């Protein structure tokens, strides 16, 4: 890599706040918050609202039930 032409890039810990999942990957993001790692080093921490672990599609969790059929809704609504 040419010197001085590339943005500063450093190992940072990406944390999923929802599921408390921590992984270390390179980024040009700088975080004031820094967290310890399994290895004897401390890296800046990037907090993620959602991640592969948390995201519904990845998990396959169904947040909402499927829409009822027209026959089903009719019977349920009027109790018939």
């Amino acid at each position: 890599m040419k010197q001085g032409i590339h943005p500063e890039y450093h190992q940072v810990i990406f944390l999923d706040t929802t599921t408390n999942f921590k992984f270390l990957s390179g980024s040009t993001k700088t975080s004031s918050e820094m967290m310890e790692w399994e290895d004897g080093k401390e890296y800046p921490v990037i907090r993620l609202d959602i991640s592969s672990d948390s995201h519904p599609f990845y998990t396959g969790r169904q947040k909402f039930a499927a829409a009822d059929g027209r026959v089903e809704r009719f019977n349920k609504k009027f109790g018939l």
């Binding site: 990406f14 992984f23 990957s25 959602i50 991640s51 592969s52 948390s54 995201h55 599609f57």
Partner: peptide
């Protein structure tokens, strides 16, 4: 590093992500 981030973080952040 980029690929792991894409699957782990960037792809989840995609709006109305359906795979």
């Amino acid at each position: 590093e980029f690929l792991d981030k894409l699957i782990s973080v960037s792809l989840p952040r995609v709006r109305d992500f359906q795979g």
